[PDB]
Design an enzyme around this catalytic site. Sequence first.
Site, mmCIF file in Angstrom:
data_model
loop_
_atom_site.group_PDB
_atom_site.id
_atom_site.type_symbol
_atom_site.label_atom_id
_atom_site.label_comp_id
_atom_site.label_asym_id
_atom_site.label_seq_id
_atom_site.Cartn_x
_atom_site.Cartn_y
_atom_site.Cartn_z
ATOM 1 N N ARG D 53 -41.971 2.026 -12.812
ATOM 2 C CA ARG D 53 -42.612 0.630 -13.017
ATOM 3 C C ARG D 53 -42.927 -0.079 -11.695
ATOM 4 N NH1 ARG D 53 -40.130 -3.681 -14.186
ATOM 5 N NH2 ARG D 53 -38.590 -2.916 -15.612
ATOM 6 N N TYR D 106 -67.927 -6.297 -21.721
ATOM 7 C CA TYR D 106 -67.107 -5.249 -22.753
ATOM 8 C C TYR D 106 -66.614 -6.081 -23.818
ATOM 9 C CZ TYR D 106 -63.954 -2.059 -24.742
ATOM 10 O OH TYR D 106 -63.179 -1.538 -25.350
ATOM 11 N N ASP D 178 -65.998 -6.162 -12.213
ATOM 12 C CA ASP D 178 -65.633 -5.155 -13.057
ATOM 13 C C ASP D 178 -66.797 -3.743 -12.824
ATOM 14 O OD1 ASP D 178 -65.552 -2.746 -14.752
ATOM 15 O OD2 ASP D 178 -64.880 -4.021 -16.528
ATOM 16 N N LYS D 203 -63.316 6.104 -17.677
ATOM 17 C CA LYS D 203 -64.634 6.409 -17.869
ATOM 18 C C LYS D 203 -65.061 7.558 -16.516
ATOM 19 C CE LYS D 203 -64.728 3.177 -20.841
ATOM 20 N NZ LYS D 203 -63.948 3.556 -21.978
HETATM 21 C C1 LIG Z 1 -64.566 2.544 -25.486
HETATM 22 C C2 LIG Z 1 -64.502 1.664 -24.527
HETATM 23 C C3 LIG Z 1 -65.513 1.177 -23.743
HETATM 24 N N1 LIG Z 1 -65.471 0.321 -22.652
HETATM 25 C C4 LIG Z 1 -64.373 0.006 -22.274
HETATM 26 C C5 LIG Z 1 -64.412 -0.808 -20.651
HETATM 27 C C6 LIG Z 1 -63.201 -1.485 -20.232
HETATM 28 C C7 LIG Z 1 -61.952 -1.271 -20.733
HETATM 29 O O1 LIG Z 1 -61.208 -0.239 -20.082
HETATM 30 P P1 LIG Z 1 -60.122 0.770 -21.119
HETATM 31 O O2 LIG Z 1 -60.914 1.165 -22.256
HETATM 32 O O3 LIG Z 1 -59.077 -0.092 -21.456
HETATM 33 O O4 LIG Z 1 -59.900 1.862 -20.287
HETATM 34 C C8 LIG Z 1 -63.424 -2.186 -19.308
HETATM 35 N N2 LIG Z 1 -64.505 -2.634 -18.618
HETATM 36 C C9 LIG Z 1 -65.762 -1.961 -19.058
HETATM 37 C C10 LIG Z 1 -67.171 -2.070 -18.481
HETATM 38 C C11 LIG Z 1 -65.791 -1.146 -20.092
HETATM 39 O O5 LIG Z 1 -66.825 -0.312 -20.741
HETATM 40 C C12 LIG Z 1 -66.984 1.229 -24.365
HETATM 41 O O6 LIG Z 1 -67.908 0.532 -23.980
HETATM 42 O O7 LIG Z 1 -67.129 2.127 -25.010
HETATM 43 C C1 LIG Z 2 -34.581 -0.270 -14.016
HETATM 44 C C2 LIG Z 2 -34.492 -1.131 -15.272
HETATM 45 C C3 LIG Z 2 -33.332 -1.516 -15.937
HETATM 46 N N1 LIG Z 2 -33.600 -2.087 -17.229
HETATM 47 C C4 LIG Z 2 -34.759 -2.585 -17.790
HETATM 48 C C5 LIG Z 2 -34.661 -3.213 -18.860
HETATM 49 C C6 LIG Z 2 -35.796 -3.676 -19.603
HETATM 50 C C7 LIG Z 2 -37.177 -3.053 -19.013
HETATM 51 O O1 LIG Z 2 -37.811 -1.839 -19.518
HETATM 52 P P1 LIG Z 2 -38.804 -0.971 -18.725
HETATM 53 O O2 LIG Z 2 -37.820 -0.715 -17.196
HETATM 54 O O3 LIG Z 2 -39.794 -1.858 -18.556
HETATM 55 O O4 LIG Z 2 -39.060 0.165 -19.570
HETATM 56 C C8 LIG Z 2 -36.034 -4.246 -20.696
HETATM 57 N N2 LIG Z 2 -34.697 -4.635 -21.551
HETATM 58 C C9 LIG Z 2 -33.517 -4.465 -20.809
HETATM 59 C C10 LIG Z 2 -32.188 -4.920 -21.259
HETATM 60 C C11 LIG Z 2 -33.632 -3.617 -19.704
HETATM 61 O O5 LIG Z 2 -32.207 -3.140 -19.343
HETATM 62 C C12 LIG Z 2 -32.143 -1.625 -15.475
HETATM 63 O O6 LIG Z 2 -31.307 -2.649 -15.913
HETATM 64 O O7 LIG Z 2 -31.590 -0.588 -14.606
#
Ligand SMILES: C/C=C(/N=C/c1c(COP(=O)(O)O)cnc(C)c1O)C(=O)O
Ligand SMILES: C/C=C(/N=C/c1c(COP(=O)(O)O)cnc(C)c1O)C(=O)O
Lengths: 384, 387, 386, 387
Positions: D53, D106, D178, D203
């Site tokens: 992350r 979009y 964008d 895309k």
């Molecule tokens: C199915 C998706 C279409 N578009 C997406 C899109 C996104 C959003 O991006 P993610 O789809 O979240 O990767 C952001 N910015 C622009 C100018 C976009 O065209 C579509 O138009 O057909």
């Molecule tokens: C390096 C991360 C540790 N923890 C994370 C954590 C998250 C966050 O989850 P993502 O890391 O976003 O999947 C959410 N909720 C709880 C109780 C957590 O312990 C750690 O403590 O060692």
Amino acid sequence: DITTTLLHPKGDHVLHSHAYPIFQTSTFCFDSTQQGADLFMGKGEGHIYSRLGNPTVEQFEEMVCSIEGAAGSAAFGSGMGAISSSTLAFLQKGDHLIAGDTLYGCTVSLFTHWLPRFGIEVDLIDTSDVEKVKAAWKPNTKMVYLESPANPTCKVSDIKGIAVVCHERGARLVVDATFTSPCFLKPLELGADIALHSVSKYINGHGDVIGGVSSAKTAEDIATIKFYRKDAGSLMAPMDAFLCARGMKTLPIRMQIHMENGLKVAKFLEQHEKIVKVNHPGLESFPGHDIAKKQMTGYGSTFLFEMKSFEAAKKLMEHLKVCTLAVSLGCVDTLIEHPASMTHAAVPENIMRKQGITPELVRISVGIENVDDIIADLKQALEL
Amino acid sequence: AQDITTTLLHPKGDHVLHSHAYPIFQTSTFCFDSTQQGADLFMGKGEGHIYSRLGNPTVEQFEEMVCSIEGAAGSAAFGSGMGAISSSTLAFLQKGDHLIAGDTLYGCTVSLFTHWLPRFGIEVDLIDTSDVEKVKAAWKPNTKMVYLESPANPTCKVSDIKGIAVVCHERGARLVVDATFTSPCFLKPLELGADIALHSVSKYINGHGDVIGGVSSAKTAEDIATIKFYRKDAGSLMAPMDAFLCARGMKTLPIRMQIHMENGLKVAKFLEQHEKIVKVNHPGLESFPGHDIAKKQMTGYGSTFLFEMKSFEAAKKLMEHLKVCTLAVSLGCVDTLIEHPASMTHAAVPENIMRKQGITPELVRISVGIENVDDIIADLKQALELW
Amino acid sequence: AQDITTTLLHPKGDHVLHSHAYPIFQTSTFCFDSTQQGADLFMGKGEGHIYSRLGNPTVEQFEEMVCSIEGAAGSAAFGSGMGAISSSTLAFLQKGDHLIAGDTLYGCTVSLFTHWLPRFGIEVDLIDTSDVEKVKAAWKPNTKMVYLESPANPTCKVSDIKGIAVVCHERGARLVVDATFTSPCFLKPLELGADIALHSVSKYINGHGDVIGGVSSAKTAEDIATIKFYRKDAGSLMAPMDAFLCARGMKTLPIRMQIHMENGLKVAKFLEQHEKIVKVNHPGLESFPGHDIAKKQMTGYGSTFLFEMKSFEAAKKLMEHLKVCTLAVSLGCVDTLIEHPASMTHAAVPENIMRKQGITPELVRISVGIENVDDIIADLKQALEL
Amino acid sequence: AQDITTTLLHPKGDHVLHSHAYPIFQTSTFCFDSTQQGADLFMGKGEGHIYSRLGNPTVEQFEEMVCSIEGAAGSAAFGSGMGAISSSTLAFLQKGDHLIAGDTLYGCTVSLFTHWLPRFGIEVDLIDTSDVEKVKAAWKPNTKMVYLESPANPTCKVSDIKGIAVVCHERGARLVVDATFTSPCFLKPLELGADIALHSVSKYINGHGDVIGGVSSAKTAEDIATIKFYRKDAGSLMAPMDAFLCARGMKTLPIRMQIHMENGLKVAKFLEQHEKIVKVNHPGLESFPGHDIAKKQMTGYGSTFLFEMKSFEAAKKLMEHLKVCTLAVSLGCVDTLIEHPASMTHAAVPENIMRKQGITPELVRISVGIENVDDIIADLKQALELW
Ligand SMILES: C/C=C(/N=C/c1c(COP(=O)(O)O)cnc(C)c1O)C(=O)O
Ligand SMILES: C/C=C(/N=C/c1c(COP(=O)(O)O)cnc(C)c1O)C(=O)O
Ligand SMILES: C/C=C(/N=C/c1c(COP(=O)(O)O)cnc(C)c1O)C(=O)O
Ligand SMILES: C/C=C(/N=C/c1c(COP(=O)(O)O)cnc(C)c1O)C(=O)O
């Protein structure tokens, strides 16, 4: 136990990564001409090309090597790749091979159609009897190939006994241990020269990869196997090695459940009115029991049982709600299959007879579901 | 006639759950509806899958793509080019048969034909296949197969595939051609008379240096079935994830090959006129012996070729001072690769074969990628001009 | 009634092309049969897919699996536990709302609640949720949500989810519970009255240390729809490959948890009677403050917990001479992990909140894996003897 | 000056275990040498990794490629374009701030801005950004950001980025652009004055229709840090496998965009002269309003554009009888896609915004792939000439 060893394998972390990375690469960079030239002559540490060696694949190899007690291990694209490489790396025209009469369908095919075309004499014989092995012996016998317990009948062979015959008479002993996993059967420890598995089964255990592995007692022999592999070309893909290594982390834990579940299901079936007979190596009634009890530290969960007719077998296989009708074995969920018409359909009628495979036999591979749920599923398909 | 670019981007088959990209069937086994439906599939009756060793949908999609550029009856994918070569030869050859193979081959094919086949009672002769008369002179009553690489790895030696095919067809031998160096965009051995055309997909077809794999295509349904029967028992399989990557790589094969061809020729011409370079072996050059056969039988050129420096020390100084080219084995990648055949890809080839191949320590092999060609030439030029 | 092991190994749904393993839909988009059919799917009419951000079959399979153990109306998978947390909170909270959160939380949860929410006009009070009366006292007319972790990261402090849920039901507020530390095998918050149960999938659920992901599960269909609507716009997606690995990992969750539990307890007890150890914070120890509530509300324990060394120097000496345990952040892996919260996972939390959490340079957090316990104790024992 | 093609094929950074392809770091956590070395990494001193992350090596390789074409101080990868858009806006805007955004965007960006931001106390106006005077008229003491898509999805409406950047710079607002529809080969908003350039990687950049992902690049080290600080708490991550695929896709980005651009222009001209077509909105056409701005601010054109049929029924007849174009949402894939904005990508846009956007049931959006252009044109022609 083996769990600690499998979770803490030998070697360095790459860029401090906790999970070992996936080297999805074909080739490797050289620092200089000398360094590359040196690597092709086997001097220095490093990599050249993934077919000669891939770090992710080598990591899985090391895992199997340590659990087998080998000098080295080689992973392949399939069990069949490991099988053909663990045999044709050594056998040549004019050599003779003795093989167990009961084997996985495609192994029969290999030994029966391909080896004789390459001038290799092959005799399938009843390897549960050491004297039958001594009698089939010839001056040109270079190898004995065993599965034990065998697919699909679980027929047991005396690996220790046959190994002594092989050491005395100058032959390699090769054992396909797929059905039992390296948790419970370690053939190199019994005197075998080579131990192999379809990793597609228990070792991976998750039904999402096909792979093979072969392990050799000597450095020379594993080197020969890898030399063959370089030219025959059955490789484990880096992604598949990532998944096999990952699945292997739960291997000892999964086998414990497999073994206990397989045993309980077998007993249920054995005392059921509908079942003629159950071929499970861990039962006191099964003819291989004393040898299996002695040469193995546990049992796999795939075995065969006999129904009273084809109709009854079909009816049972087709009315399971939890078990899946499918070939393969050693997956986390329960699989069921009909050898005569599936895994062993292509076996010549004459070898079929010797194996004792009939349309009344059904083969089950008990997963790690709660046993009472799978006993209940079988119960309703038998009685209802 | 639909262009090859279009065909590769629109392969036949139904979509799976309406997915646009073909899914990765990372599965070992398949479920049966009934014991009959399963028994039938094992008999070859009906439509469906059993087990990934026997047939996997993602791999099958990649095989369909290849089969369509090649003009084949079917294609089989393998874990490596070597898996494809083993299965296209040992699937047919048996004790007592004879194979004629080109004397200039990829090093591990040399090892396969030279160490393994003879152990299986197969007689093998490595022959100069650039001369049809020499192929005829090596022929025997038990000759069953001719195996060629053209242009050969690494010297680019050209064989007359057509002329050789006539002799195979008159005498009952299979002609098997390894077309790795040229790609199926430019060399279609099934259109030239071969019975089998095969590739290391590891190179151009995948094109991205991240997969090892092989493919073999047969003119005849029977032959592709035999090859797959062998594959089932010998076990060199393309993994579903690797198939997904090769199919994805192949979507840009035609445009990549167009750039590879044009870059490779420009680089060869630059080298050919450079003071430091003795000789350039590129089959697209007019000075190359076999240029006339290559220009008639192929429809373009790959971009991997060999050149001669004045000395080994000159070759090393060049190879070790490049900033764009990468020192490494393999070829057909999107980025430029360079290697020294004598101590690398061909270091294990027996002395007499290496001598008949013409491989010396002065030779360098380059696999030109799709970088801007001026950047590639400026990189070579700065290294050749070193203090 | 089918056992949970059986349920996870036999998820509902059709096989794709008869494939035993569910395929990886590494696709962005999906084809339509006709304009009408595409248009209908955009209106939620008929069955099918449009675009992986709206829904991916591989991801949905994993979602179904989680929804089954939780007992939810539905589940949503995300790119990380933080994606789950953000989407489970900001899908509902808006400017002028007030949130009460447990005072001891994962470090980035603290960062989220303390840095981002107040920028969006949401009032946040961090309070000690192990005492239900402090929750009541902290209440306001605009309180819309209570957010808890129990046992809390990293001190394992236990809150009475069931008592706090009664208050939330009475007063018109959602109860959201982060159950990462315990897994859905042992803690089912929706069964205790919570409105939402979430996990960092990166931990026990996947259990193999090779993916990051989150999941959130809601009691009502309307709430899970709202969460998915937020997800469509905020864009924290679980990748199809990661979903494939989490589903696969989850196939062994029940047996892995059983070992994690029994292993963790044995290691906690070993440390509790070692002379170098001031205290052990494991909710499964009789000596632990919230033990009674925890035994009642949970059906087992996770294997991550905190213990106290005599000094920073001793804590450091221990962490740096272990041969089996790995010095690293994260938890719930098959292998044993160890971390120093004061300078790692909780290094960024303000003095203020660290005081109230009771985190000091002397605390060490261990996440006990599924290795043979005897090997983990031997490693620990050997380090404590230098 | 080294070409972009070369730069993408030769990214900065050491090889890992000499691997030629960059490995996939499918890991969540990373090991520490000592407690000090880990403590240090949490403070930001020293080289190394903590947790995927916070940073993953495979994802960082993809980020450096993008950062290199954009000319940015740094880039951040996300699980989707929407994750990039969220993190590029909400990392900066807070209650009391004002955002000016384009009125043609979009669909889901509209949803983000009109549904989510107001709930967080952010004020939003959607403005015709093709008129710099309308942007100036909507400006308030608290304006902190202008967000543009140009050419806009789906109408290709062109904004004057350069002119609008001047006003942002004078008044202390961030300009966020964008640039999904054009790709970073042809539109580099950081060179025109933006503070942030972002893309849906789903895309063109990835190009192969098999990954969803987002990327955002910032002119300033401070801004990219803030974006990544938001990412760590909002949790929209690019998965290691997805990053591997996007980087591999991006290796052919320059050549793919070159064919996209030419194909798209040729298809637009074909449609523009066709009796059945009322109007074609491609910013490369002389007849298009804003062509003069597009031609000055971009170095080429994407291949996704919109055209007007005589009726909805005519549109539906066209869309449903193609054999090479695939009816589906999304764009920038190697194969050609076609879509009905009014009932698909923009079906959720409020009536007032859709009237402002200009979207009618007569419009069809086509995303032209890299198939042979004659095949694509012949496929459109046969559908337009149906009985
Ligand atoms: C199915 C998706 C279409 N578009 C997406 C899109 C996104 C959003 O991006 P993610 O789809 O979240 O990767 C952001 N910015 C622009 C100018 C976009 O065209 C579509 O138009 O057909
Ligand atoms: C390096 C991360 C540790 N923890 C994370 C954590 C998250 C966050 O989850 P993502 O890391 O976003 O999947 C959410 N909720 C709880 C109780 C957590 O312990 C750690 O403590 O060692
Ligand atoms: C479908 C396959 C079954 N078996 C296979 C198998 C293999 C061959 O392993 P690959 O399948 O090539 O990985 C090798 N060795 C043994 C004892 C086997 O059972 C089956 O029986 O159901
Ligand atoms: C490192 C490999 C090189 N060649 C390989 C190759 C293969 C073998 O293909 P796999 O490598 O098994 O996919 C088959 N056929 C030809 C003409 C080849 O060049 C190389 O030359 O640099």
